[PDB]
Amino acid sequence: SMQEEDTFRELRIFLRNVTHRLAIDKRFRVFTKPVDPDEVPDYVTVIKQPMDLSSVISKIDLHKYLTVKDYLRDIDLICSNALEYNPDRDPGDRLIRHRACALRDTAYAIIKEELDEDFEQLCEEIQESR
Ligand SMILES: O=C1CC(I)=CC=N1
Ligand SMILES: O=C1CC(I)=CC=N1
Ligand SMILES: [Cl-]
């Protein structure tokens, strides 16, 4: 229905705003664009599902997210990709891991404060109906 289309449009507006807020944070610059393969040639070797905030915007705009749960799966992938690719004790790896945990924690905290649970439940019920 047009009411269900309106629901998913509201979802996309909400997710674009959360993603924009993460992308303008200087801590998260490293997560804003895909890893340049020249600069890091073994990335795509090790990381099977690369994810970054520009890709998330692209996926919103392609109507790939029908629930906030599906969006948080891609945020969780940005974090787990960084924990897997940068596991060492050296400060460069520890800094990226801390920034990745902070991205994830920030996205979850914005959604805890600003997503209505009944709006999420509606999206989940429309998604399950297809
Ligand atoms: O080693 C890296 C680089 C980048 I850019 C993102 C995640 N891990
Ligand atoms: O880095 C990886 C992880 C997995 I699971 C399969 C292949 N490469
Ligand atoms: Cl830095």
Swiss-Prot record:
It is found in: Nucleus. Signal peptide: none annotated. Residues 3-114 form the Bromo domain. Highly expressed in estrogen receptor positive breast tumors and in osteosarcoma tumors. Induction: Up-regulated in breast, uterus, colon, ovary, and stomach tumors. Induced in breast cancer cells overexpressing NCOA3 or treated with estrogen. Down-regulated in 5-fluorouracil-resistant derivatives of the colon cancer cell line HCT 116. Residues 108-130 form a coiled coil. May be a transcriptional coactivator of the nuclear receptor ESR1 required to induce the expression of a subset of estradiol target genes, such as CCND1, MYC and E2F1. May play a role in the recruitment or occupancy of CREBBP at some ESR1 target gene promoters. May be required for histone hyperacetylation. Involved in the estrogen-induced cell proliferation and cell cycle progression of breast cancer cells. Belongs to the AAA ATPase family. Interacts with ESR1 and NCOA3 and these interactions are enhanced by estradiol. Interacts with acetylated lysine residues on histone H1.4, H2A, H2B and H3 (in vitro). This is ATPase family AAA domain-containing protein 2. The gene is ATAD2.
